[PDB]
């Protein structure tokens, strides 16, 4: 089906791919990132899922609808579905695992996302004034999943492809809690199971024969590695001892690799947003004042054209403005200044803070180990010490990935390299990490006028009303310069010429095995 007819497939079907880390955990309730969803998405499927494009597809849900108001959405689950135990996947193991998530007890970082779906009551429970039995979520019967939301939510659909919102085997965690996701215990719905684990080095996947869909399915077997390094990934990648990179390259390499790996170099347009994120509750990002000098300061261009070099394009503001519904969001009226000025301007406003030559602003910009992150750290570092003529001094902090999520989600950090991808594709994915009550805040952000701003979008009847909610509330966080934004996502990848499957056309750029397969010639 996925291939076409009279293609020549190899016989094994084994793929070697880069996950780029470590992953926090195989629990998609515990987790945040994006190698954690890579490893899900292979052994969990949800409501809805998606193609080599983006595209949306039936998942284990077949069918769906909402009404007219955009308020109930109904879903009609596969009556043969299975679990890879043989267990019958069924509405209750959506009931409960959209209660585990907004659960209190489970301390989600995405336990937002049932509040952004605005499902009645999500918001009380995560705030531990009701039950989460009293989710608005249920089983009308063993086949049907409804959900019910208290405010329109047209992008509801793509809302529910998310990882935070996979189906969990309810008879399993309730047996065995948050062990079930130990090798030995795991029980999934998707595609693949867990072959194998070695912590730091490789994930190992074997097909899912249970599956609804596995007579689709081609790659038998496949391995993430964990590489952090983008030239490592690269350097891999030529030895062919790995088929697929992360989405990361050295951007010294970018243009010999373009000449020499004719039709392997994929560079996708992503919704995406890199990023410094300041620490709004830590002295002294806390100030207003210190947070706008760092943003006149940083020229974008110097990152984007000079480091990396590879298609990101400079931004100021968090959300991508080619994202569906954000086409009125204004970039800021001070990138349009020359760096002259802008600079003049960072200057007055730290030395009114008490910087100096002597006595400098200090702190340290904590990233992931990634070459790639460190060199444009080393740019920003430079710029900002340069820009100011010397009243910042910035030191580098690299944590392992597991370690500097721990560290941003727990505050223990002045600025931190962030990256935000979409998780649908819609402005409020972005715009909804900068509520004051959002469990992705780590910014630890507070606008009761942004949250205002935020809310006018559902009084909104079309789309134009929705996009001009985002655009003001872009505005307010713009003018309390709650982060320093630096580019969107391009995502550059080596893919084998043998490999297919992979567009370079999917806005979020996810990899599920079940879409891809390797051709013989």
Same mark, same amino acid.
């Given at each position: 089906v996925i291939v076409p007819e009279g293609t020549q497939l190899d016989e094994k079907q084994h793929i070697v791919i880069n996950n780029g880390a470590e992953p926090q955990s195989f629990d998609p309730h515990k987790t945040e990132g994006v190698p954690e969803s890579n490893v899900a998405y292979q052994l969990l499927e949800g409501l809805v899922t998606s193609d080599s494009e983006g595209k949306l597809q039936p998942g284990a849900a077949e069918s769906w609808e909402n009404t007219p108001d955009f308020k109930t959405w109904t879903f009609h689950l596969r009556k043969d579905a299975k679990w890879s135990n043989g267990d019958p996947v069924t509405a209750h193991d959506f009931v409960f695992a959209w209660r585990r998530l907004v659960?209190?007890?489970?301390?989600?970082? =995405?336990?937002?996302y049932l509040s952004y779906l605005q499902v009645e009551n999500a918001q009380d429970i995560i705030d531990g004034k009701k039950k989460p039995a009293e989710l608005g979520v249920e089983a009308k019967d063993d086949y049907t999943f409804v959900v019910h939301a208290t405010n329109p939510v047209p992008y509801a659909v793509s809302l529910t492809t998310h990882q935070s919102l996979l189906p969990l085997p309810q008879k399993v965690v309730e047996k065995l809690g948050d062990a079930w996701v130990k090798k030995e215990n795991y029980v999934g719905n998707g595609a693949y199971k867990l072959a194998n684990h070695i912590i730091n080095e490789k994930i190992e996947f074997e097909r899912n024969?249970? =599956?609804?869909?596995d007579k689709e399915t081609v790659i038998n077997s496949a391995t993430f590695l964990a590489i952090e390094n983008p030239s490592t990934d690269v350097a891999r990648y030529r030895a062919g001892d790995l088929d697929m990179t992360s989405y990361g390259l050295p951007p010294e390499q970018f243009a010999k690799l373009k000449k020499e790996l004719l039709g392997e170099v994929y560079v996708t347009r992503t919704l995406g947003t890199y990023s410094y994120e300041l620490n709004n509750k830590k002295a002294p990002f806390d100030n207003v004042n210190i947070r706008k000098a760092l943003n006149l300061s940083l020229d974008r261009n110097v990152i984007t054209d000079k480091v990396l070099g590879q298609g990101q394009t400079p931004t100021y503001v968090f959300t991508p403005t080619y994202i569906e519904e954000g086409h009125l969001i204004q970039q800021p009226a001070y990138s349009k200044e020359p760096m002259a000025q802008r600079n003049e301007e960072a200057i007055k406003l730290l030395e009114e803070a008490g910087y100096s030559k002597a006595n400098p602003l200090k702190f340290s910009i904590l990233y992931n180990t990634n070459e790639n992150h460190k060199k444009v750290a080393i740019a920003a570092a430079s710029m900002w010490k340069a820009n100011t003529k010397g009243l910042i001094d910035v030191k580098l902090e690299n944590q392992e990935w597991k370690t500097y999520i721990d560290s941003r989600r727990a505050g223990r950090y002045d600025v931190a390299r962030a990256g935000w991808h979409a998780?649908?594709?819609?402005?409020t994915t972005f715009?909804?990490?900068?509520?004051?009550?959002?469990?992705?805040n780590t910014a630890k952000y507070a606008n009761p006028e942004y949250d205002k701003a935020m809310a006018e979008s559902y009084a909104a009847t079309d789309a134009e009303g929705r996009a001009k909610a985002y655009a003001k509330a872009e505005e307010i966080l713009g003018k309390d310069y709650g982060i320093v934004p630096i580019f969107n996502y391009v995502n550059p990848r080596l893919v084998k010429?043998?490999?297919?499957?992979?567009?370079?056309?999917?806005?979020?750029?996810h990899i599920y095995l079940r879409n891809l397969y390797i051709i013989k010639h």
């Open positions: 659960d209190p007890a489970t301390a989600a970082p =995405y336990a937002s024969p249970l =599956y609804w869909n998780d649908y594709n819609q402005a715009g909804n990490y900068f509520l004051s009550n959002s469990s992705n010429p043998y490999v297919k499957g992979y567009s370079g056309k999917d806005p979020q750029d």
